[PDB]
Design an enzyme around this catalytic site. Structure first.
Site, mmCIF file in Angstrom:
data_model
loop_
_atom_site.group_PDB
_atom_site.id
_atom_site.type_symbol
_atom_site.label_atom_id
_atom_site.label_comp_id
_atom_site.label_asym_id
_atom_site.label_seq_id
_atom_site.Cartn_x
_atom_site.Cartn_y
_atom_site.Cartn_z
ATOM 1 N N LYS A 10 0.882 -1.188 0.000
ATOM 2 C CA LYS A 10 0.000 0.000 0.000
ATOM 3 C C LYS A 10 0.901 1.214 0.000
ATOM 4 C CE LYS A 10 -4.596 0.590 0.439
ATOM 5 N NZ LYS A 10 -5.502 -0.274 -0.429
ATOM 6 N N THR A 57 -4.024 -5.569 0.293
ATOM 7 C CA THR A 57 -3.355 -4.292 0.553
ATOM 8 C C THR A 57 -4.171 -3.502 1.563
ATOM 9 O OG1 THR A 57 -4.328 -3.047 -1.306
ATOM 10 C CG2 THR A 57 -2.256 -4.323 -1.760
ATOM 11 N N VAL A 227 29.754 22.517 -8.073
ATOM 12 C CA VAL A 227 28.815 21.845 -7.181
ATOM 13 C C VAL A 227 29.489 20.557 -6.680
ATOM 14 C CG1 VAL A 227 26.555 20.717 -7.095
ATOM 15 C CG2 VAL A 227 26.842 22.876 -8.344
ATOM 16 N N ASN A 254 21.560 22.042 -10.153
ATOM 17 C CA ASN A 254 22.168 23.355 -10.204
ATOM 18 C C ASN A 254 21.040 24.175 -10.892
ATOM 19 O OD1 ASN A 254 23.670 25.662 -10.544
ATOM 20 N ND2 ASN A 254 25.322 24.720 -11.781
ATOM 21 N N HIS A 256 19.725 27.205 -12.463
ATOM 22 C CA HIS A 256 20.413 28.384 -13.034
ATOM 23 C C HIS A 256 19.668 29.696 -12.919
ATOM 24 C CE1 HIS A 256 23.173 25.441 -14.589
ATOM 25 N NE2 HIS A 256 22.193 24.809 -15.220
#
Ligand SMILES: O=C1NC(=O)NC(C(=O)O)N1
Ligand SMILES: O=C1NC(=O)NC(C(=O)O)N1
Ligand SMILES: O=C1NC(=O)NC(C(=O)O)N1
Ligand SMILES: O=C1NC(=O)NC(C(=O)O)N1
Lengths: 295, 295, 295, 295
Positions: A10, A57, A227, A254, A256
């Site tokens: 689930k 489930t 980075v 990153n 920009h």
């Protein structure tokens, strides 16, 4: 054809729990989203329509609420280990449980400079997560993480000296904006079972706090060369501070922010040292990853 | 057929601006998303393919960046008034400009208990917005707002005494969880033009801070009789504290957290006074609105 | 302070209904999301904590399911009118009901070139909506719409002859890509009540189909002079085809696809007549609106 | 500490390409979102701030556009293999390229029963994806998939005979609604290099079409015993129809639609055989997975 792998369960089970201190009247809330997937001797449910081997489930959903009622839900590493252990102990034919928990922030409000006893604010969408894999005969593997921590520094990021060839247009720079959403994961040494996880309970919240603190301080203070270089410094420090962590993984976009040349308009200067107004770019974005372990 | 109304412009223009104090080395960043729509004598662009009357939307985009380069971008009420006034003064045939600005949070980081000079964190997705309508000959109408402020209180919310008929199944309660996302808007008295907006500059940030503070304190301290009753108390207070506001509008969802009856399982008690674990509901949600003005 | 306006109710109520033809065995499903907000003599719930005048939002939720059980849910204009009329007739102090319905697509699957009796596919996120305002003594005002219809044409869009001044950098063009998400709304003549809405039932689905068809054909065949010019042509046609519509409103983004100059790389030609690869832009976007009515 | 794994590159690179048949005037568009991550001898960029080994992510972005200009972008399995091979051949120190491509639908419009030469519609958010891993000395591994295919059947789904214990409240059923979003992935035999991928070009689109067709037909026609049983039947068939596939993986949510008991209201019957109105549940959801391979 044959079943090579199978797991089911689930997802997106939202759970809230409140703790009420009768002494002080102070209340504390916890809210999470849980996913539990099971594996085991269940192939016949797929190949022969044999539902006899299936824990529905819906029943997994019930079990999560019952488990949260009977046990502490914090730190999430403990709750996840209890929940996953339950399935492998209860059902003879289930041999692995995979539990993923996302913890949502409900931070106590300060009203008039004093902490309120029962009012909370969602301060950002940053999450604290765990992934716990409980596998019969192989212990408990826990990966803890923080994600959705969005930061920006407006200077003290550089990027020069990279490879230049016929595909390259990027100019070298000694001053750019760096902004990212931090996803950091620390993987614990394998634990033999619930007793061992319980023995280390205090380390979980403390290691999360350290991971967060190191991330923020390093991002703020590093005169970043790339980075790549900055994230490695973060990972190094976390490993040095908690011996029970085996590896640290970072995944950083990153995001920009481009300069806007306005010189076409009355010679306005808005580039290089004169850059004040920038255009944040929604896409594309750099994506930089690394996993750091011990020598 | 005829054109009854028309407006056009550029939406989703992301803008970042940095201010650098050369004295202290402290940097401050602002990031917003702007939309500008124009109205005026432009019907022929629709009916006769006459593009001569159209300021291209690309040009509107350029104008926003140029305006941000040449003027302060805070408080957003001022920036929006400057930007909208520009269009109606520059173009003879444009008679109204509608500017909407969404301000994103970039909160200075504290590293080692000290504010960092150039590092910021996005602390939540709460926004501060403005809508500014600049209409030739009719001044400047500004609606300021905060939105995306998500809070929860775990007790001190009640809901009883409502109408009961054959469509009603809800049980009365004297203790429930109340959680909402606050959208609050304060509409200023009409301003005659830019000079008048400039004269009240200091009031904008102060009124935003008051609106936020009143919202949080009232939510935390009111032993709520209904969402209706609590929101009216917030609105009353804001109007009492800023005479230049004409109306205050609140729009609040009631995000439900349902009890889970677990008594079917070994007689577990999890309802009423024993409720600890709840199921947050993603939908449906109550939606309660009100606009409060002066007697 | 006083309450100037107030409305409240339940939002995001998901509803599914199935119709089963016992003769043919064919099943047809409908799925919608409904919001109902009420207005009336309810000010005291806000100002005096008087819940006696409040129909709880939970009860509004129940009413929507009961109404869908007892009435047809299609066309949505009829269902919305029935649902809104219920509140103003049932409750003496409620004087207006505002019902918004979003219809989700479940299109019958074709398997082996034949329509399947009970299997459906969500073919796109395009919606069909209605907004119905039922106001005591003022009849029923219905606005019907389609939204989320995303299209693109790769040529036969132009944009030249627009105003050029010192804020303009956009080059004129005789061949560009035009892509948009269509939001089109047609407002019906006011209806006196439910009997009148029932009398026009067949026109609702037919007018939706016409609106969609005209939108698609006009977009595909017009050698567009601007978004403004093309949208007016659509609106003109819909008004000509259905006399009971008073106005048609279109709101269209201009989702930009930019050329990419690759000439820096080995003189590759990718602009103007040689443009093959473009960069879709997520933001900003043009936003063009117009409301067209009868002379 | 040491770098155990590292990869970096550019994500969310949106690319559109148009093909223009000069003979017929027919235009065909392709739009995708691409991510490329590289691995190789780049550890020093992380550990020593040595950017000399880094192909800037901006350059990776340029390379994707240049590659799309010079090569076919369909089928995506071929484009991805060309793009990934480029990096490992061009840069001596880069030893693996990981390319993920998401293809967006732009389906030709039919206007007046005839296909339009240059107008397209986004018919649903279903995607066709590829993941291509090009690893020096180890060939090319391609995983193809379809995702975002949302379907519902209103009957002919059952779920009974599952395990019942003290955690179980779910009633057995012989008639329920089954709705899911299909994510299906087929993994190809390892290819030795680009020449081998080119030799099988025609199989890629054909296998995607077969996978889709089998999924839809099986879902529609199977009197489902569980999600597990139905998905295995789909996977079996795809493997039987394409010998070059090694495994098929399905991941399916079970999106619940709950009955609503309305008997409290005037004895209205809306359950079991009388169920007409249901409440779609946004969460939680079942999540069922399986990977099927050859005996
Ligand atoms: O690999 C990279 N690392 C960075 O820090 N920046 C870039 C870039 O492309 O700007 N690329
Ligand atoms: O109108 C309402 N106001 C509230 O505060 N709560 C409810 C409710 O339905 O729970 N309804
Ligand atoms: O007003 C405008 N109408 C259009 O059709 N295009 C533009 C544009 O800015 O490209 N602007
Ligand atoms: O494992 C399960 N398979 C299904 O098809 N349905 C359920 C269920 O919980 O309804 N559970």
């Amino acid at each position: 054809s044959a079943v090579k792998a199978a797991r089911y369960g689930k997802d997106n089970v939202r759970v809230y729990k409140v703790h009420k201190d009768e002494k002080t009247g102070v209340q504390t809330v916890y809210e999470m989203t849980v996913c539990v997937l099971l594996e085991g001797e269940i192939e016949t449910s797929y190949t022969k329509a044999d539902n006899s081997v299936i824990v529905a489930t819906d029943s997994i959903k019930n079990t999560i609420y019952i488990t949260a009622k009977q046990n502490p839900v914090t730190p999430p590493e403990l709750f996840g280990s209890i929940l996953g252990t339950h399935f492998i102990e209860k059902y003879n034919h289930i041999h692995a449980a995979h539990v993923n928990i996302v913890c949502h922030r409900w931070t106590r409000m300060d009203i008039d400079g004093k902490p309120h006893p029962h009012s909370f604010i969602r301060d950002s969408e940053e999450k604290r997560n765990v992934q716990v894999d409980v596998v019969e005969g192989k212990g408990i593997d826990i990966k803890s993480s923080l994600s959705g921590l969005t930061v920006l520094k407006s200077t003290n990021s550089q990027f020069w000296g990279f490879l230049r060839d016929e595909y390259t247009t990027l100019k070298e720079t000694w001053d750019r904006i760096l902004s990212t959403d931090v996803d950091a994961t620390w993987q614990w040494k394998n634990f033999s079972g619930l007793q061992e996880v319980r023995s280390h309970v205090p380390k979980f919240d403390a290691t999360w706090a350290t991971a967060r603190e190191v991330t923020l301080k390093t991002f703020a203070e590093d005169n970043s060369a790339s980075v790549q270089a900055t994230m490695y410094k973060m990972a190094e420090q976390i490993l040095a501070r908690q011996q029970l962590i085996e590896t640290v993984e970072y995944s950083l976009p990153n995001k920009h922010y481009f300069e806007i040349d306005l010189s076409w308009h009355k010679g306005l200067q808005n580039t290089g040292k004169n850059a004040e107004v920038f255009a944040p770019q929604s896409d594309p974005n750099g994506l930089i990853k690394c996993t750091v372990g011990r020598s």
